[PDB]
Amino acid sequence: TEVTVLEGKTMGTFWRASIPGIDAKRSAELKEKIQTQLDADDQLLSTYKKDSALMRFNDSQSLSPWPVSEAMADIVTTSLRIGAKTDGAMDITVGPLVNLWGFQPVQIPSQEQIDAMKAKTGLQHLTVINQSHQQYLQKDLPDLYVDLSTVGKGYAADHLARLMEQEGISRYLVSVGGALNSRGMNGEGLPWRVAIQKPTQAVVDINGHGISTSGSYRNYYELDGKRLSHVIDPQTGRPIEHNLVSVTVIAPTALEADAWDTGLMVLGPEKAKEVVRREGLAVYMITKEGDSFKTWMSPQFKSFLVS
Amino acid sequence: ATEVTVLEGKTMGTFWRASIPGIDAKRSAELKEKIQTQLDADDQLLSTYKKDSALMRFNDSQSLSPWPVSEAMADIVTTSLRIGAKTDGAMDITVGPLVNLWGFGPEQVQIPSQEQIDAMKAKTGLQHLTVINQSHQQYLQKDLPDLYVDLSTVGKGYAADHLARLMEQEGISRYLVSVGGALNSRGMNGEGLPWRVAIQQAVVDINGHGISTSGSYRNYYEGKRLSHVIDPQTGRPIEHNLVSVTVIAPTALEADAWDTGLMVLGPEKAKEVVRREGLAVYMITKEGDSFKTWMSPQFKSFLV
Ligand SMILES: [Ca+2]
Ligand SMILES: [Ca+2]
Ligand code: NA
Ligand code: NA
């Protein structure tokens, strides 16, 4: 059967929904629902909009529980846990440190300034409180600053998938930026096509899962022998220096994948592989070694490959 | 055409099954061991019939302060409380004392007076339980010492989802796993077709999804007696004619949570929730000697 592709803009990037063919009125109605939901998610999570739910929390100096939506609570919960499991490499409180660099560095902070700033960051400073009819965030530092840009697209893709289910669409491939979520087979009873970066192509079936990628071998800045990156390691408060070009993660949700791919990118190849082993993650890595790109997959990732 | 290996065993007072194509005897044996070990651990985490389960340690405590639990415990309870809210209290993981008052637990009295029921209701309610999450730790907290939490209505869905995680960990991409009536389906069977999932036979294809069924069987094969399903709000047996609910959801845990709540609510109130939440649901009602069925549009999308 045929396929309808809807596309639009959100979160500084694009969204796409590929679904079984629907009629024109149905397609228009669905696109309106999708854009409305994504607009609301952007308004929930954005740091750019000073009136977002997130930015209202940031602007509050309260150390008491702060009411939030179920989505906010769950995004932060997942972020804190994957933060913990990547030894702090995935850190949604690192904003103040990032703000020191203007992210080649053009304005560089001293070691003293870095140290002063990391005192206003830390995953330990956040708590999520869930109850039946309400939920909260709580910070123990008034000027803690939370930034969800590294996990927002993954959530948005998951939420987009749930919207499809609610609309009686149980076969789909949806995406927000590089974060994808898919369930069910395509019109020909085969996996929805999800292609992986081939640096020199591998295809995966992410049915029942989400996938997300951090980095690209086509946006890998490198001067002399040094990596040039605007990605700040939250434990050093400095840009990463390793040769991990891109990391792709398949996880049970795109939110999780989006959190993992960020943490693993920060950790770099050796430490990322230890986390991948420990957690049994499905991961694909591209590294730059001399004049060649090298690829690597965990056993769990290989199981998702299609032929 | 490739051979499907079927592994089965006991867990949580019921049985589990895993169907996996193209797997050899050595791998099957290793996989059965891992499955049983994991399910044993999930039973040890959740069971109210195991005196030293993680859950029973919490239940036995009189503490009103945060109580450390596993990530899985935190998420199961969070999911349960929210779906409890969205079913207007019908799905209630704190209803145990009322069920025990009637003696309607599976492993066990006089008919209680309404006065006694109402007094017992003071020891129950979704509002009494909180889940707290932090980077390296998470907690349950009750504001009533004798609150009693029972997760039997969602434990099978969780366990089935957790089995899917194990399949992935083990590099198994095609499978049908089930714990009692909770299942997850992924990929093609040995014949290269979607796993056959039958509802009592109408057939659904739930590839990439989970499913669960809940029912009321005291009169299913007759009515001559009461339902043993207690309405958490009245503290009395349900009086409506809904005898089975099947839910298809992205996860078996969600499915298992909804099917219990919808079952308690009954046909009219369940349909309201199903519409508002856009759920994929199949309902069986028994009027007198005649069964009637109803499917939401979202459920119909899964029919073959
Ligand atoms: Ca990310
Ligand atoms: Ca249930
Ligand atoms: Na700090
Ligand atoms: Na009560």
Residue numbers in the entry:
A (entry chain C): 13 to 115, 120 to 216, 223 to 329
B (entry chain A): 12 to 119, 122 to 213, 223 to 244, 247 to 328
Authors' account:
We were also unsuccessful in our attempt to obtain an FAD‐bound structure of the Ftp_EcE169K protein variant (this residue is analogous to the active‐site residue K165 in Ftp_Tp), but once again obtained a structure that was determined at a higher resolution than wild‐type (1.75 vs. 1.88 Å) with a similarly improved final Rfree parameter. There are four monomers in the asymmetric unit of each crystal structure, and the r.m.s.d. of the monomers within each structure ranges from 0.5 to 1.6 Å and 0.3 to 1.6 Å, respectively, between the two structures for approximately 300 Cα carbons. John Wiley & Sons, LtdIn the site previously denoted in the Ftp_Tp structure as metal binding site 1, a single metal ion is bound in the wild‐type and Ftp_EcE169K protein variant structures. Aided by the high resolution of our structural data, two water molecules were observed bound to each metal ion and thus the coordination number for the metal is seven, consistent with a Ca2+ rather than a Mg2+ ion as observed in the Ftp_Tp structures. Refinement of the metal in this site as a Mg2+ ion resulted in large positive peaks in a difference electron‐density map; these peaks disappeared when modeled as a Ca2+ ion. Thus, in agreement with the original structure determination, we have assigned these as Ca2+ ions. Superposition of three representative Ftp_Ec monomers illustrates the inherent flexibility of the loop region near the active site comprising residues 237–253.
We recently reported a flavin‐trafficking protein (Ftp) in the syphilis spirochete Treponema pallidum (Ftp_Tp) as the first bacterial metal‐dependent FAD pyrophosphatase that hydrolyzes FAD into AMP and FMN in the periplasm. Orthologs of Ftp_Tp in other bacteria (formerly ApbE) appear to lack this hydrolytic activity; rather, they flavinylate the redox subunit, NqrC, via their metal‐dependent FMN transferase activity. In the current study, we identified a bimetal center in the crystal structure of Escherichia coli Ftp (Ftp_Ec) and show via mutagenesis that a single amino acid substitution converts it from an FAD‐binding protein to a Mg2+‐dependent FAD pyrophosphatase (Ftp_Tp‐like). A high‐resolution structure of the Ftp‐mediated flavinylated protein of Shewanella oneidensis NqrC identified an essential lysine in phosphoester‐threonyl‐FMN bond formation in the posttranslationally modified flavoproteins.
